[PDB]
């Protein structure tokens, strides 16, 4: 992978493997996930960032966390094919930033995805959120395309859409979900792309089988800590639409929201 | 990835991925597993399978894996390039053999390898059999006549017994269920998902203060999409050496049996 020619932004080629697909034999939505994950850490790197954070963050303690993820797929890649990710950030003033994502089939040069995900500041040991402040902004700025630049630009688009929150009873779940160390990330969190798994795992298997996920929009509202337990709770809303609550399975305590919507094949 | 020179071996170069590493940065060993997989698989793909020989598909036989052992002497880190090179040799009617030998792509020292053991099996009834000699001579073209061990040595770990623990286990972790991600494009349970599951058992001040080296691992019975799995670990052993039982949570039917070998950092 490398920067793009003005610096402003990152691309990178992946070829899909063979335990990244699904029954379609084409990637699932979690690789796809992941991947956008990949092509974001080794753009934060190529900028000049220590193996995550500007000189004001650190000195702060303070963290980019994201608060919401939306994706949209409009073809899955298939086994052994090359997928290639443009990658960029904008500054979103002093509510946080944006990290948006162009996935292109590399051998036909088309559009087969698109993804924007929403991030704010926290400070890392009390998890209070904060406001950007003017230094952090003006550190991180010179990395970023100053003029508007976005993924889903159309007026009205789904990734802005408020989430309403499920009502109990809920039409399909699934219960007891608790992560094993390999949804951990490096720092011992539970990794952002396992409650995208979480939450697909309500979905009844006929729907998965009958249908193709076209869109999902994920709102991160606390986390899941390695100890915890977690049910997935769904309803249809409506093409398929659902409606998604992952919340702790003790105590009721929401940890996300999200819509999904579903193609017939 | 290409096969090598005389066509009777597979090489394939991969850097490592951010989500792919633990807590120290360095890669977990269900990401070297996976990777495993992946070379295996494009090696099958580059000998002309479409993986099943004439012969297999028309008696509704497939290739499942019985046995797994690796050894890790450095865990590769987050974006270093590990090359790693995979086999095949025929063990008579037996069954058949892979091996892996990992290494670092910068500095030419093996860093890691790896042995399976394969047996033949009817798809639909789960029957094993022998190889017979119509298959045997299908693949036999593919693979080096003469020995080539990953594993030489005259009483390496790789053959080595296991015996079944007796409850009670000295450590355990009830009640876990594959997710969609933990299945294969076939939709059964992915074999690299059985090593965490194993690893589940095992206390996380062992993991916070000990680098694994060797596993092996036995796999005697699938677990399906809707099973429930238990882990249970007991310490036999400056090395800490642990046996390992997976089974059923309701009836306690035994699915894998294995050990472990952890020096400490
Ligand atoms: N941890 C991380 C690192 C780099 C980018 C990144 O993008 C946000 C995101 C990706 C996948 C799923 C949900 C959210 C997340
Ligand atoms: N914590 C984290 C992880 C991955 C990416 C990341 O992006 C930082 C960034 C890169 C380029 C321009 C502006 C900001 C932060
Ligand atoms: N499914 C598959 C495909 C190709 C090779 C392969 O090697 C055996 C193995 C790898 C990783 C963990 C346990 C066993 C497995
Ligand atoms: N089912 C399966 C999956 C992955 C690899 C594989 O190996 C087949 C093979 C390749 C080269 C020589 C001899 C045999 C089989």
């Given at each position: 992978?490398?920067?793009?020619?003005?610096?402003?932004?990152?691309?990178?080629?992946?070829?899909?493997?063979?335990?990244?697909?699904?029954?379609?034999?084409?990637?699932?939505?979690?690789?796809?996930?992941?991947?956008?994950?990949?092509?974001?850490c080794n753009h934060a790197q190529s900028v000049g960032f220590s193996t995550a954070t500007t000189t004001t963050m650190?000195?702060?303690?303070?963290?980019?966390?994201?608060?919401?993820?939306?994706?949209?797929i409009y073809k899955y890649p298939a086994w052994g094919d090359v997928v290639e990710i443009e990658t960029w950030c904008q500054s979103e003033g002093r509510?946080?930033?944006?990290?948006?994502?162009?996935?292109?089939?590399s051998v036909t040069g088309e559009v087969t995805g698109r993804a924007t995900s929403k991030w704010?500041?926290?400070?890392?040991?009390?998890?209070?959120?904060q406001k950007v402040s003017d230094d952090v902004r003006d550190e991180y700025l010179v990395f970023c395309p100053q003029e508007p630049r976005l993924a889903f630009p159309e007026e009205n688009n789904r990734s802005l859409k408020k989430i309403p929150k499920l009502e109990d009873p809920a039409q399909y779940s699934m219960i007891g979900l608790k992560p094993r160390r390999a949804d951990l990330d490096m720092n011992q969190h539970v990794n952002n792309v396992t409650y995208?798994?979480?939450?697909?795992?309500?979905?009844?298997?006929?729907?998965?089988?009958?249908?193709?996920?076209?869109?999902?929009?994920?709102?991160?509202?606390?986390?899941?800590?390695?100890?915890?337990?977690?049910?997935?709770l769904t309803t249809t809303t409506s093409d398929?639409?659902?409606?998604?609550?992952?919340?702790?399975?003790?105590?009721?305590?929401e940890i996300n929201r999200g819509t999904t919507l579903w193609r017939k094949k």
């Open positions: 992978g490398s920067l793009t020619e003005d610096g402003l932004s990152y691309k990178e080629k992946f070829v899909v493997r063979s335990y990244e697909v699904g029954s379609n034999k084409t990637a699932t939505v979690e690789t796809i996930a992941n991947l956008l994950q990949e092509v974001g650190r000195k702060l303690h303070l963290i980019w966390v994201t608060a919401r993820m939306h994706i949209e509510i946080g930033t944006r990290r948006d994502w162009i996935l292109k089939d704010v500041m926290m400070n890392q040991d009390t998890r209070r959120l995208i798994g979480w939450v697909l795992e309500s979905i009844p298997q006929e729907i998965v089988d009958t249908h193709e996920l076209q869109v999902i929009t994920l709102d991160y509202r606390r986390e899941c800590q390695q100890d915890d337990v977690v049910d997935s398929s639409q659902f409606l998604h609550l992952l919340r702790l399975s003790g105590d009721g305590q």
